[PDB]
Structure 1
Amino acid sequence: PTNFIRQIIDEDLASGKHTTVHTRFPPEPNGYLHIGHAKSICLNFGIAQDYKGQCNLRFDDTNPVKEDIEYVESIKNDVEWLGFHWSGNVRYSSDYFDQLHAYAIELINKGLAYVDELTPEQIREYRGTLTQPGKNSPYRDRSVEENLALFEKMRAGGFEEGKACLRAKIDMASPFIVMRDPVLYRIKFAEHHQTGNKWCIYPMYDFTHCISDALEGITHSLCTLEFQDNRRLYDWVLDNITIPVHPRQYEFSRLNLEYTVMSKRKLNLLVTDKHVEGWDDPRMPTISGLRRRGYTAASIREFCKRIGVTKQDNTIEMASLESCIREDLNENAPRAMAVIDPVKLVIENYQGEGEMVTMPNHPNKPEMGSRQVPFSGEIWIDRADFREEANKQYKRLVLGKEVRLRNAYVIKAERVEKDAEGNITTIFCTYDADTLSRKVKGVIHWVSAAHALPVEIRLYDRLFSVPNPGAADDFLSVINPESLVIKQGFAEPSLKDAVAGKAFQFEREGYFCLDSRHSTAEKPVFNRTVGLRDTW
C-alpha cells in the first residue's frame, strides 16, 4: 500500500539521507481516540513496522487545563487494542519541559525571543489580519538581559496569567500569520497531570512539537493539513536552536466520516450532555465506541488501508467502513439463529415435541464444525417473514405458499389468528415429514420456542440525520432519535455461551456481539454491529 509519504521515505532511504525511519503518534490527552486517530495510527505505526523502523507514542501534554489522566489511559489501551506497539516507553512532551525551557533561553540569548506584555486582546489587534500586516509590539526591543530576567520572572510566578508571555521574534509582516511573533510560552497556574505544580509556564504546540520530534530522533513527522502553515514555524525553531537533527514534516488530509462528527470538542459535548452513554457508546466514532459496537481491530486497519493517504479533503461514506466489518465477519463469525421481532408459529401437524437438527457453524466453512440445534412444533419466526398475501416478489411465508426453515424441513402456512387490533398473535401450519436433508422457493430463520433463550437486541443507526452534522449551526439538533432502538427477542440455545468480544452472524439479520455493559447473567444483550446487505 503506497502513498506520497511512503514515496518520500523510499527516496530518503535511497538518497542516503536516512538509514532508518522513526515516526510517532502524538495525541493530546484531552479526549478519547476516534476513527480519525486510527488513520494516523495506521499511517505512523504502519510505516514504522513496514520499514523496520520505530514509532513512538507521545502524549502532547502541553496544555494542562484541557487535559486529564483518564485520557492517557484509554488512548494507550486503544492503540494497543488496534494491534500496534510503540518504541520504548510512552513519551510525553512534558518529559521535555526542562529542555524546552533551556531552548527558550537560547532563543532569548540570540535575540530571537522576548517577553511581551501586550494584553491578550492587544496581541490580537497587533497581529494584523489575513490581508493586512501586523505591527511590532512596543516591548519587542527589550535587551537580552531584560528578557532573561523577565522570563525567569514568568517561570517564578511573578506575573499573573495573561500579564506576560514569551514570544518568538520573527516578522510581523509575514504573509504567514503563524510567523507573526508566535507565542512560545504562556502563564498558567494549573496543575499538570505529569509534572504537578512544578511549572506555571507552559510551552505552546509549535515550539514543543518540532523540538520533541528532534530530541526523539523522529525522521518524518506526519500530521494533518491544518498544520501546513505551521511547518514554517516548525522549521524556524529547529533552524534557530542548537540541535543536531532536523525532522521533516509532511501533511495529509484528515479523515471525515459521513453522518458523524470527528472533532474531539463535539464528541466530548455528546458525552458531557449525556446524549450518548459515554465515550464508548456503540454509536460513537471513537475506537472504544466502534469496539463495543462489534468492529474488529482488523476491520479498522483494513479500512485505514483502503481509504488511502493524500492531501485531498474527503468524507468517506459509512458504506465503506461497514463493508470492511462485513468482509471480516463474513469469514470468521460463526452463524447462529435469532428472532428480533417474534411471532408464534404452531405446526399442528407436528407430533408433540422434541428433536435436534445439525446446523453448520458456517454455510461455506465446514472446518468450523457444526452445532446441535433443537427443533419443535411451536417455534418463533420474524413477523417480517410472514404475510397473508404478497406479490410474487415476496419469497417468505404466505398463507397459500409453503416455505423452508433454515437447515430444517419445509412447512406450509394454513391458518392465522389475530387479536382485537388485527395483529397476528399466532400462525398455524403443517410440514412435510420427509425433508430433513414441489418448488418451495424461500428460506427463513427460526427459534424453537421450547428451547428458546430470551435475549435483548440493540439495533443501532446513524447518530445524525445529515451527512455533514458538523456543518449544521447546532449539530446536536440534528441527532437521529432512532440511533438506538431496543428489541426483545429469542435466540437458539447455543447463544448463552456468548462472551463479550465474540461476533456471531444471526442469519438473514446481520452481525451481532454481546454487550457486557448491559448483558446480565439473567438477560443477555446483543449489539447489532451491522446489518446484512439487504436488497430484494
Structure 2
Amino acid sequence: PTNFIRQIIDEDLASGKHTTVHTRFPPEPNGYLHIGHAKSICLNFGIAQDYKGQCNLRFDDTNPVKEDIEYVESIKNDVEWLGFHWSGNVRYSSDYFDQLHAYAIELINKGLAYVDELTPEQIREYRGTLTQPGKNSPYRDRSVEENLALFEKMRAGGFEEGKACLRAKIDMASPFIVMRDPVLYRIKFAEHHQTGNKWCIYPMYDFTHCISDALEGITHSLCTLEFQDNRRLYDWVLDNITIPVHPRQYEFSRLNLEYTVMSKRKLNLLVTDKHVEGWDDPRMPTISGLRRRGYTAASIREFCKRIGVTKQDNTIEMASLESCIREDLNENAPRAMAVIDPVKLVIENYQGEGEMVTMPNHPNKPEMGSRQVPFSGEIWIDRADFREEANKQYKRLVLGKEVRLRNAYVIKAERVEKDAEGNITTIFCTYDADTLSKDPADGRKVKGVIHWVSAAHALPVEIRLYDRLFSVPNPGAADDFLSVINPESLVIKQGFAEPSLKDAVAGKAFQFEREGYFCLDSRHSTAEKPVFNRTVGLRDTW
C-alpha cells in the first residue's frame, strides 16, 4: 500500500539524503485517541517498521492548561493496544523546555525575537486580516539587552499572564498570517503535569514542534493538511537557530467518518455532558471506544490501510469500517446461539427433558472444533423467524409450514397462542426424529434455517444494540451537533443465549448466528447478568 509520502522517503533513501527513516506520533495529552489518530499512528509507526527505522511517541505537552495526566496514560495504552511500539522512552516536548528556552535566547541575540507588550487584543488588531497586511508593534525594535532582560523577567514570573510574550521578528506583511511575528512564548501560571510549577512561561506549538523533531533526529515529520502554512514557520525556525539537522514536514489529509465527530473538543463535550458513558463508550469513534464495541486492533489497521494516505479531503463511509471488522471476525470469531427477541415455542410432539446436539464453532472451519448444546421441547425462537401468514419470499417459519432449527431437527408449526392484545405467546409445533444429521426423510425440501436457544439451559443475557451516534452524515457541520444525536444509538434488549456463553471473556469476539458479532461488556456485565455488545450486525438483506 504505497502513498505520496512513502515515495518521497524512497527517493530520499535512494538519493542518499537519508540512510535511515525516523518518524514520530505526537499527540497532545488533552483527550483520548480516536480512529483519526489511528490513521496517523499506522502511517507513522507503519513507515518506521516497513523501513527498519524508528518511530517516536512524543507528547506535545506545550499547553499545561488543556492537558491532564489521565490522557497520557490512556494514549500510551491505546498505541500499545493497536500493536505498535515506540523507539526508546516515551518523549515529551516538555523534556526540551530548557532547550527551547536556550533557543529562544539565541533568536533574541540575533534580533529575530523580541518581547511584545501589546495586549492579547491589541496583537489581533495589529495582525492585519486575510486581505490586509499587519503592522509592526511599537515594541518590535527593542535592543537585544532589553529583550534579554525582559524575557528573563517573563520567565522569572515578573509579568502577569498576557502582559508580555516573546515573538519572533519576521514579516508583518507576509501573505502567510502565521509569519506575522508569531508568538514564541506565552505566560501561564499553571501547573504542568510533567514539570510541575518550574515554568511560568511555555513554548508555542510552532516553535516547539520543529525543534523537538530536530533534537530527536526525525527525518520525516508527518502531520495533517491544516499545517501546510505552518511549514513555512517550521522551516524559518530551523533555518535561524544553530542545530545540525533539518527534518522535513509532509502533510496528508485527515480522516473523517460519516455519522460521527472527529474533533477532540466535540468528543470531550459528549463526555463532559454525559451524553455517552465516558471516552470509551461503544458508540464513540475513540480507539478505546471501538475496543469496547468489539473492534480488533487488526481490523483497525486494515481500515487505515484501505483508506489510503493522500492530500485530498475525504469522508469515509461507515460501511468501509464495518466491512473491515466483519472480515476479521468472520474467519476468527466462534459461532454461538442467542435470541434477542424471545418468544416461547413449545413443541408438543417432543417428550422428556431433552438431549445434547453437536454444534460446530465455525461452519466452514472444522479446525475450530465443536461443542455440545442442550435441546429441549420448549426452545426459544426469535419473533422475526415466525409468521402466521407470509409469501414465498419469507424463508422462516409459517403458521402451517416447517422451518429448520440450526444444528437440530426440522420443526413444523401447527398452532399458535395469543394474549389479550393479539401478541403471540407460544408457538406449538412438531418435529421429524429422523433429521439431525440431514435429509427431510421423504424429501420435502425445508426452506430456511433459524437459530434457537433451548429454554433448558438458556442464559438470561442482556444485549446492547448500537447504531450511528448521529442521525446526520456530517454532524460536525450542524449548527449544534448535539441536537442531531441519534436517540436510538443504544437500545437495550433482554434475551437468552446458549449456556456455553457464560464462559465468555471480555475481549473475545463471538458471532451470534443470523444476528452479528458480539462481545462481553465488562463494564456492565455482572456475575448474575452478563452483558453483550453488538460489534456489528451481519450483512442483512433478503
Do both proteins adopt the same fold according to a TM-score greater than 0.5, normalized to the shorter chain? yes
Q: Matched residue pairs, number?
A: 536
Whole-angstrom CA distance in 2 between matches of 1:394 and 1:352: 32
Whole-angstrom CA distance in 1 between matches of 2:511 and 2:498: 12
- Deviation track 1:425-456 (CA, whole Å, cap 9, x = no partner) reads 00000001100110111100000001111100
2:509 is equivalent to residue 519 of structure 1? no
Q: CA deviation at 1:354?
A: 1.5
- 1:329 is paired with a residue whose SS is helix
Whole-angstrom CA distance in 2 between matches of 1:7 and 1:72: 33
- Deviation track 1:309-364 (CA, whole Å, cap 9, x = no partner) reads 00000000000000000000000000000000000111100012221010000000
- 1:358 is paired with a residue whose SS is strand
Please name the residue that 2:441 is paired with: none
- Deviation track 1:372-431 (CA, whole Å, cap 9, x = no partner) reads 011111000000111110111000000121000001110111000000111100000000
Whole-angstrom CA distance in 2 between matches of 1:371 and 1:11: 55
- 2:10 is paired with a residue whose SS is helix
- 1:89 is paired with a residue whose SS is coil
**Sequence identity, in percent?**
100
2:388 is equivalent to residue 426 of structure 1? no
- 1:249 is paired with a residue whose SS is strand
Q: CA deviation at 1:68?
A: 0.2
- 1:402 is paired with a residue whose SS is coil
Whole-angstrom CA distance in 1 between matches of 2:3 and 2:456: 57
- Scaled by the length of structure 2, the TM-score of the pair is 0.99
Whole-angstrom CA distance in 1 between matches of 2:424 and 2:280: 39
Whole-angstrom CA distance in 1 between matches of 2:515 and 2:251: 42
- 1:124 is paired with a residue whose SS is helix
2:375 is equivalent to residue 387 of structure 1? no
Whole-angstrom CA distance in 2 between matches of 1:178 and 1:386: 66
Whole-angstrom CA distance in 2 between matches of 1:475 and 1:236: 38
Whole-angstrom CA distance in 1 between matches of 2:91 and 2:308: 28
Whole-angstrom CA distance in 2 between matches of 1:373 and 1:362: 15
Please name the residue that 1:454 is paired with: 460
Q: CA deviation at 1:103?
A: 0.1
- 2:274 is paired with a residue whose SS is coil
Please name the residue that 2:317 is paired with: 317
- Deviation track 1:183-220 (CA, whole Å, cap 9, x = no partner) reads 00000000000000000000000000000000000000
Whole-angstrom CA distance in 2 between matches of 1:354 and 1:422: 31
Q: CA deviation at 1:176?
A: 0.2
Structure 2 spans left out of the alignment, 5+ residues: 438-443
- Deviation track 1:82-118 (CA, whole Å, cap 9, x = no partner) reads 0000000000000000000000000000000000001
- 2:492 is paired with a residue whose SS is strand
**Displaced runs of 4 or more, over 3 A:** none
Whole-angstrom CA distance in 2 between matches of 1:182 and 1:324: 43
- 1:414 is paired with a residue whose SS is strand
Please name the residue that 1:482 is paired with: 488
- Deviation track 1:274-305 (CA, whole Å, cap 9, x = no partner) reads 00000000000000000000000000000000
Whole-angstrom CA distance in 2 between matches of 1:268 and 1:240: 38
- Deviation track 1:33-57 (CA, whole Å, cap 9, x = no partner) reads 0000000000000000000000000
- Scaled by the length of structure 1, the TM-score of the pair is 1.00
My pick for the range that moved more, 321-330 or 350-359, is 350-359
Whole-angstrom CA distance in 2 between matches of 1:198 and 1:377: 74
- Deviation track 1:150-175 (CA, whole Å, cap 9, x = no partner) reads 00000000000000000000000000
- Deviation track 1:463-490 (CA, whole Å, cap 9, x = no partner) reads 0000000000000000000000000000
Please name the residue that 2:478 is paired with: 472
- 1:202 is paired with a residue whose SS is strand
RMSD: 0.4
Please name the residue that 1:247 is paired with: 247
Whole-angstrom CA distance in 1 between matches of 2:445 and 2:344: 25
- 2:495 is paired with a residue whose SS is strand
